[PDB]
Structure formats: structure tokens, C-alpha cells
Amino acid sequence: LDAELDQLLQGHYIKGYPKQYTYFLEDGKVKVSRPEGVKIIPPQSDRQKIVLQAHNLAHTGREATLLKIANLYWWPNMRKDVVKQLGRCQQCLITNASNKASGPILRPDRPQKPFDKFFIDYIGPLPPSQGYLYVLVVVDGMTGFTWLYPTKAPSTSATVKSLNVLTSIAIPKVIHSDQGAAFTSSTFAEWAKERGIHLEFSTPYHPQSSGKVERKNSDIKRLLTKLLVGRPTKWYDLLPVVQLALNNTYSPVLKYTPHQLLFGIDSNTPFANQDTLDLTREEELSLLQEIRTSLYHPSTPPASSRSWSPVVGQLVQERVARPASLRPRWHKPSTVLKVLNPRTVVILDHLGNNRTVSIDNLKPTSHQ
Amino acid sequence: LDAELDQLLQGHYIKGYPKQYTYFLEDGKVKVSRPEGVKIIPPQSDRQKIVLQAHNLAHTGREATLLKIANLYWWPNMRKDVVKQLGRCQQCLITNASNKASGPILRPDRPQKPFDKFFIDYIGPLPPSQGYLYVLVVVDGMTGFTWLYPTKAPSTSATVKSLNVLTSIAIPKVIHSDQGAAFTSSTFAEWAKERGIHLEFSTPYHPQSSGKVERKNSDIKRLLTKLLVGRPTKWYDLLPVVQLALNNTYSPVLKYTPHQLLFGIDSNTPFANQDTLDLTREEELSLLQEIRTSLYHPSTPPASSRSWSPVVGQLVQERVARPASLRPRWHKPSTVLKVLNPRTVVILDHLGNNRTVSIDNLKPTSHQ
Amino acid sequence: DRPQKPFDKFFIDYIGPLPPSQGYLYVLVVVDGMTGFTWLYPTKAPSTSATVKSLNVLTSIAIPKVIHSDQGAAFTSSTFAEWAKERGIHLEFSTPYHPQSSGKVERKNSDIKRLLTKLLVGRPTKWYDLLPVVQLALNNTYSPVLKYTPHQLLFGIDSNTPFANQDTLDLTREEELSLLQEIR
Amino acid sequence: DRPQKPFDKFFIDYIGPLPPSQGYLYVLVVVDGMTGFTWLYPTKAPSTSATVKSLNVLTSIAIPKVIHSDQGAAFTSSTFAEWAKERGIHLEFSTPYHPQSSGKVERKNSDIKRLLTKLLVGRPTKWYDLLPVVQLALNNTYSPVLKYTPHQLLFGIDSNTPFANQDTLDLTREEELSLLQEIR
DNA sequence: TGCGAAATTCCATGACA
DNA sequence: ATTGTCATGGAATTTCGCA
DNA sequence: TGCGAAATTCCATGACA
DNA sequence: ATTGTCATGGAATTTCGCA
Ligand SMILES: O=C(NO)c1cc2c3ccccc3n(Cc3ccc(F)cc3)c2cn1
Ligand SMILES: O=C(NO)c1cc2c3ccccc3n(Cc3ccc(F)cc3)c2cn1
Ligand SMILES: [Mg+2]
Ligand SMILES: [Mg+2]
Ligand SMILES: [Mg+2]
Ligand SMILES: [Mg+2]
Ligand SMILES: [N+]
Ligand SMILES: [N+]
Ligand SMILES: [Zn+2]
Ligand SMILES: [Zn+2]
């Protein structure tokens, strides 16, 4: 502060203050003559207050804050003190947007067998049809084979009724769902345990995670739309048709329909493939086992030029889920406990609870 | 049809049907032995019906439809007949998504002078504050200088009251707005004509077009949010503070605040720039005129690898604005009348009205 | 002649009347001929209507080339014939009073009748809820003749519910008298 | 001494009472010293309160280093002083009974009083609506002494409303008698 | 006539619904 | 008859202080 | 042993809110 | 304690029919 500036005025060299400029006293303040003009050098003990005043005018970032300060003042390493404050402005930290992208997405392995994993989810509400408003969609991970059930609500109770019917056919090892009320209820937990089914949940507010079924929702809605053109939206009676239509549709990259992947032979539907007519069922199942293993699997894409990847101990902020109007879009900083994979983490949320969270709902806290 | 197939069966060469495969009769149908197996060659007069049946199962695109047909049939140039039908399926055309991106955005020139162009727009509704729910935002194009007025509704009448106050200061050549009810009313048209102000409108449902003000909305909401952290959302009393705060904030790329661009000198606000203290006002205005012309202007970015650009006479489809549930996202095909610029067109909408439309709300009709 | 395949033939039949369960009285039984896979559907009556409703569910998963039945009224109605014609399903009937399926199917139908009876006694009214488990049992039951369960033949994989206990299926001395008490 | 600049000094004063217009009675007048630019604000009273409300609008656009006024009650209240202190605005008063501005400002204030009077007669009650146009007039009026209008000096550009008619500003023989009829 | 560090510039990222 | 924009904070690049 | 055209594969684009 | 997906239709590339 005042000692530093004193020793300065009598022409002695201080580290930080270049020796080649002339430093003087005027109006009771230490000044210096810099290329752009004459600036006041405040005593170190005044600088935090100054940076703060500059920052608070519009809660500006690095350069916009600096440009205000440089109008009146000069000192060594101004931006270093600016950044110090930026990293302590609770309001900037929770309100500003991130300018760093998530790391490149994972492409999880395809389930090995039909019935290894289901992905389930609700669609709706839809225009009422026979008093029904939702559709439960169940997608077998390996085959894409899909079952559709109309419901009155996205309830546990309607979920259980429908799956009891479905699982008459086979019981899956795992059911993967999002964190909807329907699937996180303890009634559903019990229903699953009873049958040796393991429940797997998406990280919160991250539908990419149910990508398998979300994507199937698209085809379902899209086909329903086409079939309903110029008629009233009576979708109830079309679910069975849509189900069948989609299970028997080729995926051009795979060159197989989900039905084929499930049974290894077309049923009596239009344009049934006849290629295995001369094989025994056993020979057919043998060629099926082989088809199922050799299916195209996509790989993780290139990272974008400015992505971030989580590191244990990092300060990171979770996205506020349903932010009220004029309220911050981010939670307070929290710490990366465990890095489950490059796109999934456990954080301690300052309360602090453990939360398992997608990096897509995170930003790395700025300015360390 | 039957003549073609007859001449074929007796070993004569027909253009399209390769000579090296054996063609025969069986079960009353013309067959052929192709590498993948034996397929029925239907008579040309049957083919349209077949493609149609295949397509209609799930309203599938090129390859997914072909793969069904190839299960039973073979003929020359199958995909050509498939595509013919795809381009005639009204339901696919209006329901499917586009897989071609818009051409790269335009970066219009900055208005030359303050008051050449205003961009106006409403924000809201917001939590009620003193009985007010919206904010009228007025952004001078050249300077970014912004005026804020609280209103009870996004009405013409509140717009007119506010602008009468604003234009006490200066009258602009042009006011640019979107197609909100407030600005398209004939009462507003009259109010403008009365003052020699020209009204310019964004293409419909394309806020990029009011980008100047939309972007300013962001800063306004963002600063309001920060100031309101941990207090109730009483934003009315903060508009004046926000207005002042933002007009006096540096844009790091420009190195000027909107206030500086408007007046060429800081008023008595914190950290006022003192650089022109020794210039005469006239010398100051001279350096201002020069600063205003040399400001950074961004250029049109590179096109993405699969973009389209509009051509006069092209069949194109306008996006449905507020599509009902399970209803198509596109209007019926319509024709590009005039290409106003590479990102803006006039189309004739089959009714047919002339509409001026952004290419972002268009797709090029598939399969010609 | 080409080898027998799943969806080649579905053998259908009704079982009942049964004691009311959640308002249902009968069971439509569908057995795939090649795999022995069984689907069950609870109905309120052995009508064409109830058959059509039930087969509409099943045929939205897989469509059989041929359905085989006895000459039950529900199956010989021209409505049911109209229904099958719409789906390109050939109908096939056994001659009256002389039902024929195949060994596999006859044996399968026997298991179903016996399995139902065993589980209904003690809880003659709670069978609606039990249909799912009945099916998993039947479909994960080892076929002495083939090396495989119907599950295995339908899907080409082991099941996550292997029914390791080849069960009694016979009435225990207790259940014999419990059944002679329900009829009285 | 450094050259005179916009925002260096704002000269403020009240005009009125006037005939009620939309419930307003007075006009706060603000003139920038260097440019001669004029802002007008309608008030209900010459109070500290109305002055603060009005200057709050203006000072959310530009803040003057110094405000100059006569010793009107509204300007000498300690509330108004408190207000100016908060915005780092130095207050400056002319001595009582001896108002001093500058030639430019005195001349400007004269134009304002005369311009108002001219337009009020015939419509003494409709002046609230006329304030915007009054201002554009005053601010796009050529200064004989400087080569430029206040608009030009404030913004460094020509205006889209140049007031080409250097006007009469004097009362026509008709308006003279029309004004001697309103007072009666 | 070149080094280390600071200052400045560049620019992907995301948000105005 | 019209058309995206620009704060932001790490990283890249340039300039500065000294020799 | 290479040409023109057809078939197949590749893959950016956008949508499941 | 978990993780995007895949129909689509022009364009790129490969294969076919013939020589
Ligand atoms: O099932 C759901 N909740 O229970 C659910 C929630 C959302 C959602 C929320 C906000 C924005 C878009 C959203 N999408 C469409 C989507 C689907 C898949 C993607 F990868 C990306 C987006 C959803 C789908 N399903
Ligand atoms: O002013 C408006 N209507 O009158 C209006 C309408 C929208 C809007 C509609 C749908 C989705 C987003 C939208 N945004 C945010 C936005 C802003 C600028 C962009 F470039 C892109 C998006 C809007 C802003 N303003
Ligand atoms: Mg869901
Ligand atoms: Mg979903
Ligand atoms: Mg708007
Ligand atoms: Mg807007
Ligand atoms: N995986
Ligand atoms: N332009
Ligand atoms: Zn801040
Ligand atoms: Zn179609």
C-alpha cells in the first residue's frame, strides 16, 4: 500500500512497476505517465474496492471490467485482481452461461441379447382418444422391438398393469428409465424386485440417456401423424397398427427389422423375407446368433475444439432444472466426488447430498 | 407389362433386363434367378401398386421401402419407381423432417448513424412488479444504445406512449420489429407515417431477424437476474439502473460503450473515460465520426457441408408455425417466386398468397 | 417339403367356463405349432367378438400363416372368417368330434389344462393375475423330444427365468380333497 | 482551462403554473450548457419530489457533473441535495433575485417560454401532447453563434427532422386577441 | 535481437423462450 | 416486401520490459 | 481391364418437447 | 449409483453388365 508507493516516489525500483516511466504526486495521489495517458496508481489496500466497484456497475466479465478500471487507474497485473473478483462474485457465477462444451458423447454397447435391457418411457399428454392420454413405450435394447400401451396417466399403476401383460412373454434382466414419477416410486421398485428385474435410471433431466426409446417416440409420433392426416386425431385404435408397422420396418444401416432381430424369421406380414425357407429352425437360429453379433456399432465422435472433461475435485455447477423467471440458471459450486465415466459424475452439492449427474447439466466453475 | 415379359421369356433381349440371368415361368408368374435368390418380376402395370403397398406399411423412405420390395420382387431400376412415389406421398412430404441445412447467415451492415434504425421488441410476461408485466426494449442499431419502458401489455397503445417519450429526443428513419400484434396494427402504422418513420418487419417466426434487440434482451434479463438474487423479483425499480448500466458497458470487441458511440463522450458516471479532455467538442465529434466508421464488422460464416440455397421456381415448404399435437410440421409444397437475398424469399403458398419468408422456415421439397 | 417354422401355424382353443376372475370366465389358448410357445388371453365369453379382440393383441406382435381350430362357433362364424381374410390368414378346421393337432401341441394343451387346475385350487378366483406366470412356466419348460424350451426356439437365446424345477403338476392328497370340497 | 463539453452542466428550472393538461401543471426545463440541448418534463408541482422523479428519467440516460438552478424551494431542499450527492452531482445556485446562466442558455430559455406561449394559445389544454414536438423544434434549431444545432452538437450527425422553417415565434394579430380573450 | 511474462486479441459457446 | 448477435473466459498471439 | 450407369454405402441433419 | 439415437435423401463410392 502506502509504503510501496512511498519507496516508489523517490525513484527506487519496485518489482512490478516498470522503471522507465515517471511516477509522481499530484492532487494527493500517486500518478504515472503511460503511453495512453496519466493514470492514478491506487495503494494496494484500495484495489480490491476499485475492481469491485468497476465489476458491480453491470456485473461485467474480464475485459469489460478491465476497460472501466483502465479509464482512471493503472497498477501491476490488473487483470489478475479482476479475475480474483470474478471468481468470488456469487451472482456472476450462478447467472452467467458457460462457454465450454461437454466432452463427446458415449455410444454404449448394444445389449447382447433380446431381453437383456428394456428402455421405457411415456409419451403425452396427447389429444384424448377413448379417454386415453398417454402411451407407454417399451423398447428392447438389442432388437429395437417395441411394445405400445395406451394409458390414462403416466402412473406406476398403469405401468405395472402394462408390464405384467408384456412380461407374460419374457422377463428382462434390466429396465432402464428416466426419473419420472411412474418409475421411481417404491411400488414400482417392489414390482421389479419381485421378478428379479434390476432398475436402472437415467441421470436427472437428460433424455439422451433414454435415447433408445426417445428416438422410438419420434417414429411413433411421426407414423401416427401421417396416418391421421385430414382425419380427427383418433390414435387409440392405431397403436396396434403402428406397433406392428414399426417392428417390421427395416433400419437401413442394419438391414434388418426389429422383428427379424427378435425372432430370426418374418411372420405372415406383407413382403415377408423368404431367404431362410430351406434352413432348419436350428440352422436359422444359428445364422441369427451370428447376425446379432456383427451389427454396426457407432463410435464416440471427435471432441469439439473447446470441450471440458470432469476431474475429481473440480468445482462444477449443476444446471437449475426448472428456473423461475429472472432467477439464476445455475446452482452454487459443488465438487466432483467420482468420475463414473467421461460423461457422468457424482458431485457433492454443498448441502451436501451425493448426486449422479450428466456433464450436460454441468459447467466448470470459472476462474478456479 | 405383359408384352415386355412375353418377349422376355422366349430368350429375346429387352433393355433393362440383363441378358445373363435365366428368366422363367412358375406358378403363373415371371421369375428370375438373381444372386440373392429367385424374385418375381411383376408386369410394369403392377409396379406402381407394389411400391405403394411397400411404402404404406410404415411410410418409409427410399432404402427402407426398397428392402421390403426386394424381399419378393425384382425389376429394372427399382429405386427410380420408389422415389417417384416418395415425391407423391403428400403425408411423407409434409410430415418428414428435412436433412438439408440453411445456407450460412447474413451479417447485415451496421446502420451508418445513430437514429438510422431502431430495433424494438417486447420481453415478458415477467413476475408482476407494480402491476407491470412487460418491458419495451428499443435498441439503436448503430450504437447499441438502449431504452427500456415497463408496460402492462405488449400493446400498440403502450408502444405509442413510450415511443412518443423516446422520440422527444430524436426521430429515427426506420423502426425494425417482428410481427407481434403491437407493431403490425394499423394504429401503429399511422403513428409511424405521421412522423415520417418507415416500418420494417422481420419475416415471420424468425427472431434472428431482430437479433440486435433479442441479444440485448439477454443482457437485460441477465443483469436483472444478478441484481435480484436472494430478493423478491421487484424489477420495475431496476429498469432505470439496468438501462444506464448497460448503455455504459464496454463491448470488448468494439472497445466502446453504446453511450460513447452515441455522444462521443462519457457523462458523469463511474469510471468515465477522460481521454478527450483537451479536445474541443468539434475535435471530439471529428474523432467520433472516425471511430463510428472503422468499427469491427463480422463476415458471413462458411456454409455447412450440406446446405441448400433457394432458386426461383423451386418447390419448397414452409414450416407450420404452431403445429397441433400429432399434426404435420410442414405446409404443402409452394413455389419460390423471388429470391430477395440468399436467406430470404417470396413464395406463392398454393392459396395462393405471396409470403416473405426466412429460409430457416423452409425446406426444399424432396424428390423434386 | 420345407422345414417347419414359427408362425407357420397357431393352434387356438378355448378353456372354460371357469370361476369368475376379475370378471373373466374363459381363456383363449394359442400355441405355436413349431415352437410350442403359448399365449393365453382371458375372455368374458367364447364369442367371435372376444376372439377377435384377443387375437388383435397377438397379431399386432406376430401374424400366423394358418390358424387351426376345432369347429367351435366362435371360429366358424363368417365374422371370424372375414377377420382372417383381412390379415391373409388361412383358416383350418379339424373335423367335428375328431380334434387333431400334433403330438407337441396335444401334449402342450394337456400341460396347460393340468397346470391351470393345480393353481386354481385353493385360489379358484385369483387366476387372472396368475396368467403371466403360467405362461412363463409353460414357455420355459423343457421339451423331451427337442433339446429346447419354446422360449429358446422362438428367440434363439436362454431365458432370464429358467424353470429349473420340473414340477409335480400332480394334485397332492390335500389338494385332491380341497377340490372335492369346492365342487360340493 | 479545458474546453466546455456536453454533460458539464445542466441548467434546470420550472415553468408554470400552466393550464391543466392531462392533470399536469408545470414543466421542468433542462438545458445542457455546452450544446443547448433541451429536455422537458411535465410535473404536477414544483416540488423536490416531482423534480427527483423527472430527473431520475433524465439521469438514467446521462448524468451531468453540475446542475445549476435558482434558489427555488425544490432545488434547495436537503432531499434534493441528498439526491445529487448520491449521483456525484455538484449542485450550483445563482444568488437570490439575480439569476445567471450564460448567453446561450438565457437565449434558449427565452425561446422555450415564447414557443410554449405561441402553441398553447388556441389549445391551452393540449400542451402535454405537444412537448415531444416542442423539444425536437428547440433541438433542431440553428444556433447563430455556433455553426450547429444542439442535436448536431450532442450526437455529431444531422437529424432526420431538420426544422427548415426558422419560424415566426411571434404572435399573429389573431392570436394576440385570442390570448386577451382567454385571460378574461 | 532475444527472452519470459503480461497484455491483447481471438473465437467457440450458448442464449435472447 | 428483407438480412442474427455479442458477452464471455481460456488459449493463441502479440507486445512489453529489459538487456 | 475399362467404361457408363446402377446399386449400395456414407453421413449431416434434425427431432424424440 | 451411469452412458444418445437413428430415419432420411442427396452425394460419394462401389459394383455390375458388358466388352
Ligand atoms: O421422457 C421424458 N421425460 O420424462 C422426456 C423429456 C424431454 C425433454 C426435456 C427438454 C427438452 C427436450 C426433451 N425431450 C426431447 C428429447 C429427447 C431426446 C433427446 F436426446 C433430447 C431431447 C424429452 C423427451 N423425453
Ligand atoms: O420477440 C419475439 N416474439 O415476438 C421472440 C420470439 C422468440 C422465440 C421463439 C421460439 C424459440 C426461441 C425464441 N426466441 C429466443 C430467440 C431469440 C433470438 C434468436 F436468434 C433465437 C431465439 C424468441 C425471442 N423473441
Ligand atoms: Mg419420460
Ligand atoms: Mg421421453
Ligand atoms: Mg417480440
Ligand atoms: Mg424477442
Ligand atoms: N458400454
Ligand atoms: N446490408
Ligand atoms: Zn458479478
Ligand atoms: Zn408416405
| CA-to-CA separations, B112 to B117, B174, C24, in angstroms, rounded | 9, 12, 81
Cβ neighbours for C101, distance < 8 A, ≥ 6 positions apart: C11, C33, C68, C94, C109
Q: For residue A137, how far is the Cα from the chain centroid?
A: 22
C-alpha span between B144 and B119 (Å, rounded)? 10
State the residue for C-alpha cell 385353493: C122
Instruction: Tell me the three cell numbers of residue B104.
Output: 450460412
- Asked if A105 and A300 touch (Cβ cutoff 8 Å), the reply is yes
Which of A307, A353, A324 lies closest to A95 in space, CA to CA? A324
C-alpha span between D93 and D84 (Å, rounded)? 13
Instruction: Tell me the three cell numbers of residue A33.
Output: 505517465
Give the determination technique.
Answer: X-ray
C-alpha span between A107 and A122 (Å, rounded)? 23
Q: For residue C47, how far is the Cα from the chain centroid?
A: 16
| CA-to-CA separations, D6 to B205, B225, B275, D124, in angstroms, rounded | 42, 33, 15, 33
**Cis before B323 (ω within 30):** no
Instruction: Tell me the three cell numbers of residue B241.
Output: 439502473
- Checking DSSP bridges between strand C66-69 and strand C9-15, what pairing results, if any? parallel
- Checking DSSP bridges between strand C26-32 and strand C9-15, what pairing results, if any? antiparallel
Q: Could you give phi then psi for residue A163, rounded to 5 degrees?
A: -75, -35
State the residue for C-alpha cell 403428400: B90
- Checking DSSP bridges between strand D9-15 and strand D66-69, what pairing results, if any? parallel
Angle at which helix A186-193 crosses helix A156-166, to 10 degrees, equals 20
Cβ neighbours for A319, distance < 8 A, ≥ 6 positions apart: A205, A329, A330, A331, A361, A362, A363
Please indicate whether residue B121, judged by its CB atom, sits closer than 6 Å to ligand 2: yes
Neighbours of C7 (CB within 10 A): 22
Among the partner-chain residues C3, C6, C159, the one whose CB lies closest to the CB of A263 is C6
Q: What's the DSSP call for residue A153?
A: S
C-alpha span between D39 and B67 (Å, rounded)? 76
Q: Is the CB of A80 under 7 A from strand E?
A: yes
Which of C66, C2, C3 lies closest to C30 in space, CA to CA? C66
Domains of chain C: 1-184 (3.30.420.10)
Cβ neighbours for C182, distance < 8 A, ≥ 6 positions apart: C121, C124
C-alpha span between C56 and C63 (Å, rounded)? 10
Neighbours of B17 (CB within 10 A): 18
Angle at which helix B62-69 crosses helix B78-86, to 10 degrees, equals 130
Angle at which helix B239-247 crosses helix A44-58, to 10 degrees, equals 110
Burial B196-215 (b: 16+ CB within 10 A, else e): ebeeebbbbbbeebbebbbe
C-alpha span between B120 and B216 (Å, rounded)? 10
Which of B325, B364, B303, B346 lies closest to B96 in space, CA to CA? B364
How far does B245 lie from chain D, in Å, by closest CA? 9
- Count Cα neighbours of B166 within 13 Å in the Cβ-side half-sphere: 22
Resolution (A): 2.7
3-class secondary-structure state, position D79: helix
Instruction: Write down how long chain A is.
Output: 368
3-class secondary-structure state, position B23: strand
**Cis before B211 (ω within 30):** no
C-alpha span between B321 and C171 (Å, rounded)? 68
C-alpha span between A161 and C22 (Å, rounded)? 13
Q: Is the CB of B204 under 7 A from strand E?
A: no
State the residue for C-alpha cell 441484481: B227
- Asked if A93 and A333 touch (Cβ cutoff 8 Å), the reply is yes
Instruction: Tell me the three cell numbers of residue A64.
Output: 469489460
**Cis before B43 (ω within 30):** no
Please identify every residue whose CB atom is under 5 Å from ligand 5, which is an ion.
B 121, 178, 180
C-alpha span between C139 and A275 (Å, rounded)? 27
C-alpha span between D90 and D96 (Å, rounded)? 19
Residue B306 amino acid letter: R
C-alpha span between C48 and C174 (Å, rounded)? 39
- Asked if A162 and C127 touch (Cβ cutoff 8 Å), the reply is no
> Is residue B116 a known part of a binding site?
yes
List the 91-130 stretch of C: residues with Cβ below 8 A of A. none
Question: Which protein residue's Cα is closest to nucleotide F11 at C1'?
Answer: A306
Question: Chain E positions under 7 Å from a protein CB?
Answer: 6-17
C-alpha span between C26 and C28 (Å, rounded)? 7
3-class secondary-structure state, position B307: strand
Beta bridge mates, B319 = B330
Instruction: Tell me the three cell numbers of residue A200.
Output: 436402472
C-alpha span between A175 and C82 (Å, rounded)? 39
C-alpha span between A124 and A221 (Å, rounded)? 10
- For A256-342, strand residue ranges (E) read 307-308, 315-318, 334-341
- Checking DSSP bridges between strand B101-102 and strand B117-123, what pairing results, if any? unpaired
Among D92, D147, D160, the residue to mutate for chain B (most B Cβ within 10 A) = D160
Neighbours of A107 (CB within 10 A): 12
List the 135-154 stretch of B: residues with Cβ below 8 A of A. none
Neighbours of D167 (CB within 10 A): 10
The DSSP line for C106-172 is HHHHHHHHHHHHHHHTT-TT-HHHHHHHHHHHHHTS--SSSSS-HHHHHHSS--SS---S----SPP
C-alpha span between B172 and B163 (Å, rounded)? 11
How far does A280 lie from chain C, in Å, by closest CA? 6
Which of C157, C154, C162, C116 lies closest to C32 in space, CA to CA? C154
Largest CA-CA distance found in chain A, in angstroms, rounded: 104
C-alpha span between C75 and C96 (Å, rounded)? 13
Please indicate whether residue B214, judged by its CB atom, sits closer than 6 Å to ligand 2: yes
Q: Could you give phi then psi for residue D20, rounded to 5 degrees?
A: -45, 130
Neighbour-count burial of A232, counting CB atoms closer than 10 A to its CB (0-12 exposed, 13-18 middle, 19+ buried): exposed
| CA-to-CA separations, A269 to A241, A246, B257, B282, in angstroms, rounded | 12, 12, 69, 86
Cβ neighbours for B50, distance < 8 A, ≥ 6 positions apart: B42, B69, B73
Domains of chain A: 5-97 (1.10.340.70), 98-105+304-365 (2.30.30.140), 116-249 (3.30.420.10), 250-295 (6.10.20.110)
Instruction: Write down how long chain D is.
Output: 184
Q: Could you give phi then psi for residue A338, rounded to 5 degrees?
A: -135, 140
Neighbour-count burial of D144, counting CB atoms closer than 10 A to its CB (0-12 exposed, 13-18 middle, 19+ buried): exposed
Beta bridge mates, C178 = none
* Own/partner long-range contacts of A154-159 (Cβ < 8 Å, ≥24 apart): A154/A122, A154/A124, A154/A180, A154/A181, A154/A182, A155/A181, A155/A182, A156/A181, A156/A182, A156/A183, A156/A185, A156/A187, A156/A188, A156/A191, A157/A187, A158/A134, A158/A182, A159/A120, A159/A183, A159/A188
Instruction: Tell me the three cell numbers of residue A87.
Output: 471468481
**Cis before A125 (ω within 30):** yes
3-class secondary-structure state, position B273: coil
Q: What is the CA(A212)–ligand 3 centre distance, in A?
A: 12
Neighbours of B12 (CB within 10 A): 10
